[PDB]
Design an enzyme around this catalytic site. Structure first.
Site, short mmCIF file in Angstrom:
data_model
loop_
_atom_site.label_atom_id
_atom_site.label_comp_id
_atom_site.label_asym_id
_atom_site.label_seq_id
_atom_site.Cartn_x
_atom_site.Cartn_y
_atom_site.Cartn_z
N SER A 72 4.67 7.82 -8.83
CA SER A 72 6.13 7.81 -8.98
C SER A 72 6.82 8.49 -7.81
CB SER A 72 6.54 8.51 -10.29
OG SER A 72 5.95 7.83 -11.39
N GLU A 115 5.26 -1.15 -10.55
CA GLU A 115 6.54 -1.45 -9.93
C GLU A 115 7.61 -0.49 -10.45
OE1 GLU A 115 6.24 -6.07 -8.59
OE2 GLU A 115 8.05 -5.40 -9.63
N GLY A 116 7.20 0.75 -10.74
CA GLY A 116 8.13 1.77 -11.22
C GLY A 116 7.89 2.02 -12.71
N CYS A 154 0.84 -1.22 0.00
CA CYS A 154 0.00 0.00 0.00
C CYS A 154 0.86 1.25 0.00
CB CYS A 154 -0.93 -0.01 1.20
SG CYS A 154 -2.16 -1.35 1.16
C1 LIG Z 1 -3.33 -2.52 -12.28
C2 LIG Z 1 -2.54 -1.67 -11.32
C3 LIG Z 1 -2.05 -2.26 -10.18
C4 LIG Z 1 -1.28 -1.53 -9.27
N1 LIG Z 1 -0.87 -2.16 -8.12
C5 LIG Z 1 -0.34 -1.38 -7.15
C6 LIG Z 1 -0.03 -1.99 -5.89
O1 LIG Z 1 -0.30 -3.16 -5.58
N2 LIG Z 1 0.52 -1.13 -4.95
C7 LIG Z 1 0.89 0.17 -5.17
O2 LIG Z 1 1.36 0.82 -4.19
N3 LIG Z 1 0.59 0.75 -6.38
C8 LIG Z 1 0.05 -0.01 -7.34
N4 LIG Z 1 -0.27 0.55 -8.56
C9 LIG Z 1 0.06 1.98 -8.81
C10 LIG Z 1 1.29 2.13 -9.76
O3 LIG Z 1 2.53 1.75 -9.15
C11 LIG Z 1 1.40 3.58 -10.23
O4 LIG Z 1 0.40 3.71 -11.22
C12 LIG Z 1 2.77 3.94 -10.80
O5 LIG Z 1 3.72 4.07 -9.74
C13 LIG Z 1 2.78 5.25 -11.57
O6 LIG Z 1 2.18 6.31 -10.78
P1 LIG Z 1 1.02 7.23 -11.35
O7 LIG Z 1 -0.01 6.36 -12.08
O8 LIG Z 1 0.58 8.11 -10.22
O9 LIG Z 1 1.75 8.15 -12.45
P2 LIG Z 1 2.63 9.45 -12.23
O10 LIG Z 1 3.68 9.16 -11.22
O11 LIG Z 1 1.69 10.62 -12.04
O12 LIG Z 1 3.35 9.55 -13.67
C14 LIG Z 1 2.64 10.05 -14.83
C15 LIG Z 1 3.63 10.03 -15.96
O13 LIG Z 1 4.67 11.02 -15.73
C16 LIG Z 1 5.94 10.40 -15.72
N5 LIG Z 1 6.73 11.08 -14.72
C17 LIG Z 1 6.44 11.24 -13.38
N6 LIG Z 1 7.32 11.97 -12.73
C18 LIG Z 1 8.26 12.30 -13.70
C19 LIG Z 1 9.48 13.02 -13.63
N7 LIG Z 1 9.96 13.58 -12.51
N8 LIG Z 1 10.17 13.17 -14.78
C20 LIG Z 1 9.70 12.62 -15.90
N9 LIG Z 1 8.59 11.89 -16.07
C21 LIG Z 1 7.91 11.76 -14.93
C22 LIG Z 1 5.67 8.92 -15.42
O14 LIG Z 1 6.72 8.07 -15.92
C23 LIG Z 1 4.37 8.71 -16.19
O15 LIG Z 1 4.72 8.53 -17.56
C24 LIG Z 1 -1.02 -0.17 -9.52
C25 LIG Z 1 -1.47 0.41 -10.69
C26 LIG Z 1 -2.24 -0.32 -11.58
C27 LIG Z 1 -2.74 0.36 -12.80
#
Ligand SMILES: Cc1cc2nc3c(=O)[nH]c(=O)nc-3n(C[C@H](O)[C@H](O)[C@H](O)COP(=O)(O)OP(=O)(O)OC[C@H]3O[C@@H](n4cnc5c(N)ncnc54)[C@H](O)[C@@H]3O)c2cc1C
Ligand SMILES: Cc1cc2nc3c(=O)[nH]c(=O)nc-3n(C[C@H](O)[C@H](O)[C@H](O)COP(=O)(O)OP(=O)(O)OC[C@H]3O[C@@H](n4cnc5c(N)ncnc54)[C@H](O)[C@@H]3O)c2cc1C
Lengths: 571, 571
Positions: free
Chosen positions: A155, A394-395, A147
């Site tokens: 991210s 996972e990143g 979580c």
């Molecule tokens: C099916 C599914 C299962 C998941 N399971 C889990 C889980 O079990 N536990 C958990 O904790 N999370 C989970 N997640 C969440 C997942 O890890 C996040 O979606 C992921 O970390 C990306 O975060 P975000 O969607 O908020 O995108 P953001 O972080 O908002 O990123 C948006 C975009 O901007 C880019 N970006 C962001 N910051 C920068 C920067 N500084 N410079 C350049 N580019 C940047 C990113 O690469 C991406 O392309 C899950 C998501 C899904 C869809």
């Protein structure tokens, strides 16, 4: 000094301890025990699980779910004395390759449970925490979830808002917040939760908010979840919001040290990362069998289509991607099993490479199949839908590229800034590279070994020049960092296949000449990508114009809210 | 001599009539009439159609279907005197860009009906055929389907097995066969059917089987269809097997000439091809708006994400792909409207380019959106599912690359083989390139114009050398032909954007400086791809080793039935 190949290559060094010879880690008893598991796990996925049904139902069928618990699949790395199967990382990699070959929705459910959901208990748990929680995690009686993500923070984990406030007695913390897109969030009874806590500085007492990790039981009260979220693929996996409303968490449920939760999260993700490449190497193996079957048996233009060069090149590229990915996955797992402490760049490379490779391989399988590949019945389109998320969770692969580039630059930048910086005492102070893989690569692969060493030298030369030019400002040079990460990915790919194919040649394996071919074909093109890519960074006079134009074009789009031009008619 | 740019470039010529200046074809009345259609068609898709609902239901909702008929959308290019809207190709392109922006499942249903399903009646129908069939096609009272593909025959149309046998009187043909994956097959009352017929040679009378095209009415009897096939995307479109069992087809329902059915099919597909790029330019426009909105409003790491270079480069690349695709679509449509007879290479380029561009743009939109992009509610994943088929139908992109390369080589090979080949009479017979786009490109784009001319010269030099080396055997050199097709695609892309941006600069359009930027950024990288690609074909001593290894690796895979290697453990 670091034993990481990736750390060394950014400094222009050849550090080979974790690469050559290609590692073998299992003793004879571990090998036989693993063989006795591969058979029933494979039969279970062949005869009991139905991946199309789980996708249609948007859940794992109950008979499959209960059968997985009985197989031990919820506790593969938990020690036997704590109720698990007791596997090491390399043994785990072998079984997750079976799961990934058959059903990525099941694979993400089991990985969210044990690769990340309770992994922090294995890595950081006290003896009391391990004995209390691991037996029911390993049996699947309590499912786990990791979580971290929130509506505001994906991210950027450091920006999370969920909070945990200590009681006056210090006996417990009160946890408030919500988490988003949590795999198993609606199924879990154990949550690894990251929350901001006030942390007292040990010297001065000043209080600063920092992340802390907690083991949270659903039965502590105040925990609810949202409905399963609907998604493109991995539809059998549960994904849900998790809400924490006044949750009393005992102080002994802190995982690791108060205020070290960010490091805990990052170590869990890093530790689990090799399992992705292992699973996806299995995905690619099954997809390649389907593509080969199609090309073997489809006649068009009077011949079976495997006789046409376009199809031959697609198939050859697909297997090279599978071989690189599989070779990376087992190299990292072996490094972990052998006590490596510095493998995080290599693990991130494996995750970026394997997720993009499986996507490309499955997309090309659809193309080889023609119209059939777009149909539901063959099942390939379902695999493609499942794979899209592996480039994001996972990143995200974009953030992992920035991580690879900046982490690799870090020690080189330290060395460079050490130059000078000593005070000068004016009052009378008296006081080629030589790099070679010869003797590590097999003689039959000497030419590709030399390609790798030349590419390493080209790469390290650019890294040095760019750190001198940008210094600590390199963190903001993202167009550059993405291109350096791609060079690093290709360089690690070259040495991993040189190492694996060299061991195959040295040991006389039946497939050694084929592996030598995979390696040389991969290395010729990877060396060309590094040569051209590094020339673009260093000696191309148009590269800076491209960067300025990417920023200007993007700014114009954001100002308009979309495409700036109309169509040619103007309305 | 041909007026095609693509034909000329394979010969090292600059033939610019169909490229510069960027064509304007509509008169003032056509422009106003088109404006009066854009508004109600856009409102209909905004307010009546629901693309997520049609995807969920796996059909077009009835109110939407009937509303489309009332809008005239089943007969957009049918002349007004025959019941249609009377649009030319450029006007059609403008309306299909609206459809493609909103709903590709609706778009394929309307395109299968009119771009290919009855298009042969527009191109080849007699006066009696047009008057009999077009009014009810244009109202949608009779839906059409293009019936070419069979279980045995997709890419290789010449191999079809459906047969049509003339009666002794010659009053009719009896049609027997089945067709596979026919869009609208379960909805259509009019089928354009391709079938093998005995054809009498006019000079000798010898009989040979050749394809003939027929207009077939469902009411002729003996026609049935299978159930709708389930597929990854475009789920609202109907796709079904069509069965012909003893169908009596009147001889006056031959479309075109007996035995010329293959040419009819190819002309229909070629004629409809620009509509794909037009629709997909609209898909990309809507997807780019969604990506820009996300990047404008998402904060991460303390800034809105449009401030980060990785996102800026993704957005800039997406708009360059949309601009190239849109520019190609309207160039080809304009060439058709201006009476061009040689546009088939350009049309194939537009189809390959636009389908791959829309795929890449939508895949990167998902990446910019992060986890949200994989969810169902935003609708982006549905668009990605819809787009996968556009690389396969109306000609797989792989076969279209081979078509582009070989069709471009054909006239150059004719010229080369003309050299020599005259008999020698020994008894006393007495008897830089200079290429420039100056004066065609706008002066502010002179440097990118020179990049295009240099890239054309590099390309034509390799084409000549490879035709001399391989002669008629070039047809079998598929690794080479695919790489030549990629060079041709990039060269046409460069000149299309040079032409469009030059007109914008000359006419002083408000977006001209932005368009100049799109063009220069595209041309710098496209010129580099042609330079590196042509060097690999001509002067690279490892290229032939890659080709031999692609064939050997593929042969080893086919012999095994899949990946040859085990994982590193060997079991
Ligand atoms: C099916 C599914 C299962 C998941 N399971 C889990 C889980 O079990 N536990 C958990 O904790 N999370 C989970 N997640 C969440 C997942 O890890 C996040 O979606 C992921 O970390 C990306 O975060 P975000 O969607 O908020 O995108 P953001 O972080 O908002 O990123 C948006 C975009 O901007 C880019 N970006 C962001 N910051 C920068 C920067 N500084 N410079 C350049 N580019 C940047 C990113 O690469 C991406 O392309 C899950 C998501 C899904 C869809
Ligand atoms: C949703 C859907 C709708 C469709 N709608 C229609 C329709 O309305 N009407 C219609 O007539 N058809 C329609 N089709 C059929 C479609 O046009 C065919 O699927 C397409 O032509 C490819 O044929 P195939 O699937 O038989 O593949 P094949 O021709 O068997 O090709 C298999 C693979 O081999 C490659 N290949 C083939 N020959 C060669 C060669 N000589 N050299 C190198 N590579 C080669 C191909 O590129 C492909 O990658 C539809 C298909 C789908 C899925």
């Amino acid at each position: 000094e670091s034993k990481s190949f990736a750390v060394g290559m950014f400094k222009g060094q050849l550090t080979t301890d974790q690469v050559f010879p290609y590692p073998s880690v299992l003793n004879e008893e571990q090998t036989q025990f693993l063989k006795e598991l591969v058979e029933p796990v494979s039969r279970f996925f062949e005869e009991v699980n139905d991946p199309a049904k789980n996708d249609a139902l948007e859940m794992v069928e109950e008979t499959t779910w209960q059968g997985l618990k009985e197989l031990g699949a919820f506790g593969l790395q938990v020690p036997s004395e704590l109720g698990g199967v007791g596997l090491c990382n390399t043994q785990y990699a072998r079984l997750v390759e079976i799961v990934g070959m058959h059903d990525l929705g099941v694979g993400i459910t089991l990985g969210a449970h044990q690769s990340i959901g309770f992994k922090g208990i294995l890595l950081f748990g006290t003896k009391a925490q391990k004995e209390k929680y691991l037996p029911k995690l390993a049996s699947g009686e309590t499912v786990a979830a990791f979580c971290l993500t929130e509506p505001s923070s994906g991210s950027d984990a450091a920006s999370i808002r969920t909070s945990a406030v200590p009681s006056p007695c210090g006996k417990y913390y009160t946890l408030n917040g919500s988490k988003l897109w949590i795999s198993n969030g609606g199924l879990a009874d154990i949550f690894t939760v990251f929350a901001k806590t006030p942390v007292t500085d040990p010297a001065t007492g000043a209080v600063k908010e920092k992340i802390t990790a907690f083991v949270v039981e659903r039965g502590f009260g105040g925990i609810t979840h949202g409905p399963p979220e609907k998604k493109m693929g991995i539809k059998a996996s549960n994904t849900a919001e998790v809400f924490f409303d006044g949750v009393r968490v005992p102080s002994e449920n802190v995982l690791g040290e108060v205020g070290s939760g960010f490091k805990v999260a990052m170590h869990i993700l890093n530790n689990g990362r090799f399992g992705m490449a292992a699973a996806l190497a299995g995905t690619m193996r099954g997809i390649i069998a389907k593509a080969v079957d199609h090309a073997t048996n489809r006649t068009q233009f009077g011949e079976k289509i495997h006789n046409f060069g376009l199809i031959q090149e697609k198939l050859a590229r697909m297997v090279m991607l599978q071989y690189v990915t599989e070779s990376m996955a087992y190299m990292v797992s072996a490094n972990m099993d052998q006590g490596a402490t510095d493998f995080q760049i290599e693990a991130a490379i494996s995750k970026i490479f394997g997720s993009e490779a499986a996507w490309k391989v499955t997309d090309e399988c659809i193309q080889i199949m023609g119209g059939m590949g777009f149909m539901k019945e063959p099942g390939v389109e379902r695999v493609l839908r499942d794979l899209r998320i592996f480039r994001i969770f996972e990143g995200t692969n974009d953030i992992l590229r920035l991580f690879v580039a900046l982490q690799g630059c870090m020690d080189k930048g330290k060395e460079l800034s050490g130059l000078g910086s000593a005070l000068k005492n004016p009052f009378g102070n008296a006081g080629g590279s030589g790099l070679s893989l010869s003797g590590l690569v097999h003689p039959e692969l000497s030419r590709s070994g030399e390609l790798a060493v030349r590419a390493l030298e080209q790469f390290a030369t650019v890294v040095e020049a760019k750190l001198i030019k940008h210094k600590k400002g390199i963190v903001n040079e993202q167009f550059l960092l993405q291109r350096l990460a791609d060079g690093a990915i290709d360089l690690y790919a070259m040495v991993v296949v040189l190492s694996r194919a060299s061991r195959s040649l040295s040991e006389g394996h039946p497939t050694a000449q084929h592996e030598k071919m995979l390696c040389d074909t991969w290395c010729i093109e990877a060396a060309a990508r590094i040569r051209e890519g590094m020339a673009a960074l260093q000696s191309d006079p148009w590269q800076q114009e491209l960067y300025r134009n990417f920023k200007s074009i993007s700014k114009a789009l954001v100002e308009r809210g979309g495409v700036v031009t109309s169509n040619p008619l103007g309305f």
